[PDB]
């Protein structure tokens, strides 16, 4: 081959879009759950 | 009164469980099980923040639960082992009035309502401040004097 090899970062644009949407979907669920827990804990420390 | 159940340890009484409202309240620092099998088999929810284990009273066969209030005016209250003085934000008794093994005992007002549950206290010299469980109109709160020990 006249071309060089690919890395893990060289996936297709469509594949990257799917990865971002899936990763963002899960990351968003975690970010929301984390925010809820933080708020509850802050309230729990407001009741000491 | 007579709403007080012993919490039995392997070889001793380590505290009491009190029936207040529709819940049976036990200090989490007390180890052992309730002497009455009907309460011993009852599931409890534990909270280390309030040092409580509470469960719904089988009121259908437990109508002797004490009445309770959130009202806490300055004055004197009856806590079985003597009179307890309420001043500022704290309950105070004579230092020899209480001891380890007495936790779980309720503090009653002059109308016979439960105000607080005794967890322990701190020896302040002439008097000892009590570590107690109290409630406001909405939720349970915990008052702990500095240096207070579990009873």
């Amino acid at each position: 081959a006249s071309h060089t090899t690919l890395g893990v970062q060289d996936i297709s644009v469509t594949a990257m879009s799917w990865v971002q949407k899936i990763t963002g979907g899960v990351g968003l669920v975690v970010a929301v759950a984390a925010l809820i827990l933080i708020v509850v804990l802050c309230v729990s420390f407001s009741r000491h | 009164n007579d709403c007080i159940f012993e919490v039995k340890h392997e070889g001793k009484v380590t505290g009491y469980a009190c029936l207040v409202g529709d819940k049976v309240m036990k200090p989490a620092h007390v180890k052992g099980t309730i002497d009455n099998a009907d309460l011993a088999k009852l599931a409890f929810k534990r909270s280390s923040k309030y040092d409580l284990e509470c469960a719904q009273i089988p009121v259908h066969m437990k109508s002797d639960a004490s009445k309770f209030t959130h009202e806490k005016p300055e004055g004197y209250y009856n806590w079985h082992h003597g009179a307890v003085q309420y001043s500022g934000g704290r309950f105070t008794i004579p230092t020899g009035a209480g001891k380890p093994g007495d936790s779980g005992r309720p503090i009653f007002d002059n109308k016979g309502r439960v105000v607080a549950i005794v967890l322990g206290g701190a020896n302040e010299g002439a008097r000892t401040a009590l570590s107690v469980v109290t409630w406001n109109k909405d939720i349970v709160t915990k008052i702990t004097p500095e240096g207070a020990e579990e009873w």
Binding site: F45, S46 | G88, G89
Partner: protein
């Protein structure tokens, strides 16, 4: 070297000043609560000024 050494020193000094002012502001804002009996310190102040 002179410009970098001097500029670095001054910038670090100004950071120390910003912190010192925060410590001064914190001490003064808290003081009245430390003096007053009961001292019901509000939650927001407790988190904001670390008390």
């Amino acid at each position: 070297v002179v410009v970098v050494s001097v500029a670095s020193f001054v910038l670090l000094s100004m950071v120390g000043v910003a912190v010192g002012m925060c410590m001064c502001a914190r001490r003064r804002c808290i003081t009245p609560y430390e003096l007053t009996p009961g001292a019901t310190v509000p939650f927001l102040l407790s988190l904001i000024c670390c008390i």
